[PDB]
Design a protein around this ligand. Structure first.
Ligand code: HEM
Length: 153
């Protein structure tokens, strides 16, 4: 789907993320909740976290962010060959915790924002475009897996 060069840009910036997955995850979740406050309602264990510092101090929130970025990293490393990784992720999102595709767009925006804020020299326009294509592919294929399970996303 993406060119080999586009995948290399995605995986180059992802290696920078892996220097501090927890901190990237916290900043991504905080940015998501600030930009799109409806998304915080999907996390009932976080409703008492009122400030950014409270969110950064919550080991629970940090672990949730690492779980999500670890799954995304493994998917991105498959360079589009990711059916076996998306099926269980679609199930985790489409049953009891219905996560709309729009919310995956919102977190994709937060991912782009945080990667650029932390790694501008490794995440210029071509790298941003490549990451956007990779996340668009992720969301398109998740949406198809949602539908197979009976969830229209
Ligand atoms: C890059 C995007 C995302 C990835 C890769 C991701 C990944 C994951 C993974 C791996 C799990 C663990 C499932 C399990 O262990 O069975 C999970 C659970 C969950 N995700 Fe996501 N997630 C993403 C985005 C979101 C968003 C945007 C929301 C809500 C706005 C969300 C809400 C949840 C909830 C509610 C759960 C289960 C309960 C919990 O962890 O508190 N996820 N996600």
């Amino acid at each position: 789907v993406l060119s080999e060069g586009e995948w290399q840009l995605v995986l180059h910036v992802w290696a920078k993320v892996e220097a501090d997955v927890a901190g990237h995850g916290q900043d991504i979740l905080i940015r998501l909740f600030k930009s799109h406050p409806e998304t915080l309602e999907k996390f009932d264990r976080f409703k008492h976290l009122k400030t950014e510092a409270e969110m950064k101090a919550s080991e629970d929130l940090k672990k949730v962010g690492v779980t999500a970025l670890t799954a995304l990293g493994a998917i991105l490393k498959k360079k589009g060959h990711h059916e076996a990784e998306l099926k269980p992720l679609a199930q985790s999102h489409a049953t009891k915790h219905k996560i709309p595709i729009k919310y995956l767009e919102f977190i994709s925006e937060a991912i782009i924002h945080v990667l650029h804020s932390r790694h501008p020299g490794d995440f210029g326009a071509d790298a941003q475009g490549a990451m956007n294509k990779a996340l668009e592919l992720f969301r398109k294929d998740i949406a198809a897996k949602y539908k197979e399970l009976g969830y229209q996303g």
